[PDB]
Amino acid sequence: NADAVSVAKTDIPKVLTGLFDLTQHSATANQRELDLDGFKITAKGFKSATDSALIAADVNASTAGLGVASGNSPYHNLANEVDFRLFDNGKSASEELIVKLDPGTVAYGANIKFSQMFGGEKESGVVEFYRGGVLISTLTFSSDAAGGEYNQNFQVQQGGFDTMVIKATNNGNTNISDNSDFTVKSIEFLGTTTPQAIAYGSGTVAPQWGADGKGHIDLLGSNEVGLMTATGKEISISSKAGLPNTLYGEASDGSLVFRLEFTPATGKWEFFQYQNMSRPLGDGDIDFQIKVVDADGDSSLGSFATKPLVT
């Protein structure tokens, strides 16, 4: 149960999509900041050979991809690779790559490909996705997949993020080699290429959990039929198989009228309009449905609404 919030023509997030080939920067070996179109890339590295504290490091660009260049590590200090190392004071830490999108930009999916990490020695790591400084999604990966020509590192779970942290995790070993061999080869920001958004609406499903705590929120879809563009064409809401967090509103000429993007971890929902609509039947809002599952599994059905742009 949630009241409609009108969409608006201002402060619309720029949506970032497209595949970015991170092997095309080797001309400058070492930058503190890589600057591509829509995002920047930084790096955090070890404070010394015997200090696991993270400090600003250089992004190291090569024909294989990007890695982090710590001045010193306790062993196997690789310049072109993101490294997890143990330190003899008895604690461990990983180098970091940081993908930071430009202000007012968001992605709803990522497909990340690494290099220098398959072919024998166990290699593992994790990608964290943040939106506004909340954790939104993690993706863990490992050279137990099926070779350097194997993606499956997908994240259309949660939609919105503005920040990726890519780091290594512990592979199990002790002092010669650990998770190192891991170099970011490409990053593809998922989503269909749309027109230019003429309106935007955002709210957050925040519901009563009770005393048994939080579990998860789910995007049911949308009941709405009879929705029409202001030119009078019928609208058909739909998902792709396996991707409950993106509803497309298409117009029966095939064109996109709106998209809804949902972020389950925070409950955030974001409405993008591309064509003016006719006043939605009955109420005047587009009603989407949610199921608020529990830590047990104790369920509760509700809804969030938004009034679209209507000439």
Ligand SMILES: [Ca+2]
């Ligand atoms: Ca390194």
Ligand SMILES: [Ca+2]
């Ligand atoms: Ca290694």
Ligand SMILES: [Ca+2]
């Ligand atoms: Ca309603």
Ligand SMILES: [Ca+2]
């Ligand atoms: Ca409605």
Ligand SMILES: [Ca+2]
């Ligand atoms: Ca309960």
